[PDB]
Amino acid sequence: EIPPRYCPLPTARHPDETVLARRTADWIDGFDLELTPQQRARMRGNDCPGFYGRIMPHSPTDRLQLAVDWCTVMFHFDDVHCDEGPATGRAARFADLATRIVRVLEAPDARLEGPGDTMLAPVRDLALRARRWATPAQMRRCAEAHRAWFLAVAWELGHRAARSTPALNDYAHMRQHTAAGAATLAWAEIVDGAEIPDRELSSPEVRALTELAFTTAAFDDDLFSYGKELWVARAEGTAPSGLGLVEILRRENRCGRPEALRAAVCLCNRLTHRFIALRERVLPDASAPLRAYLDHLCHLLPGNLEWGLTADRYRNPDGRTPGAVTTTASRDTDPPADTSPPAIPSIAWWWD
């Protein structure tokens, strides 16, 4: 039971999810991943078309397919190449693969395949399709968003190998990157087909809006995937992972699980309010591509929640247990009473 979330933003579904699902399943099947039926079922439970369709419900299907296909292969990357394989040489293996992915995005004919490689062929295909539509700056943004994601995953793998729990001030600014927030959303302006001006994207107010949105969505992800984490921990007989806002607040405040859930939701509510309030100040002078970017972030927050609460990824985790985890949520219609910055110095500047 997730305490009431404040997110007064409308959500909508793309009308062509079935087509996007079919094409993305056909697309990923065309490479050399040797997907088992269990793996194909898990990808269905991921519902990539439902996810990105909620971010861009009005976009043309053939263009949105590019972002859906990226989600498809990167969910597989997460499940198969992040914190997997032999413990010996795990960090080195990840850094090796991660840098090849980034290079293929920059140089699709780099020919970096190794013995048994599977990931680079679809990545190359995404980069080649992206380059038909994207400006050079947009392609650069994709590569750098992937670097920020992958450096954060290397950070995260260190905590998982130590089974340690990050301090809140560290998690609070890193979580947007372990969630690949920017790498997920970089595809949007390519789908839209117009470059967001660098001076806008780089301005402090837009940087704040960007980090606010990606952090809120990732914390929401921590909340609607918490049940699956407790499921895994119970199956494997271990404590839940410390890589999650709920467990971080539980450890930091020496509180119960219900109290930590309330504190996590309270933080999400304050970030969401700040995003909305800062949005109102930025929109008057925003260019049309910036306005579209902020529209995508506005659909991301409620769309991410609806997707995460209803996708089988966080309800039937292994793909063989319908209803193993059921997460419920509420909508708080009242804004947070406290609109001041939280005592988290790594993110406090969002309230500047």
Numbering used by the authors: 12 to 363
Quote the authors verbatim.
We recently discovered the cattleyene synthase (CyS) from Streptomyces cattleya and studied its cyclization mechanism through isotopic labelings. Some polycyclic diterpenoids have attracted increasing attention, e.g. gibberellins are phytohormones derived from ent‐kaurene, while phorbol esters exhibiting the tigliane skeleton are currently in phase II clinical trials for the treatment of acute myeloid leukemia. Substrate ionization is mediated by a Lewis acidic trinuclear Mg2+ cluster, bound itself to a highly conserved Asp‐rich motif (DDXX(X)D) and an NSE/DTE triad ((N,D)DLX(S,T)XXXE), to which the substrate's pyrophosphate docks, with assistance of a highly conserved Arg residue (pyrophosphate sensor). Here we report on the crystal structures of apo‐CyS, CyS complexed with GGPP and Mg2+ (CyS‐GGPP‐Mg2+), and the CySC59A enzyme variant.
Apo‐CyS adopts the classical α‐helical fold of class I TSs, with ten core (A‐J) and three short α helices (α1–α3). The Asp‐rich motif (D89DVHCD94) is located on helix C and the NSE triad (D232DLFS236YGKE240) on helix H. The CyS‐GGPP‐Mg2+ structure shows a similar fold to apo‐CyS, with a root‐mean‐square deviation (RMSD) of 0.24 Å for Cα atoms. In the apo‐CyS and CyS‐GGPP‐Mg2+ structures, the thiol of C59 is close to the phenyl ring of F86 (3.4 Å) and renders it towards the active site, while in CySC59A this interaction is disrupted.
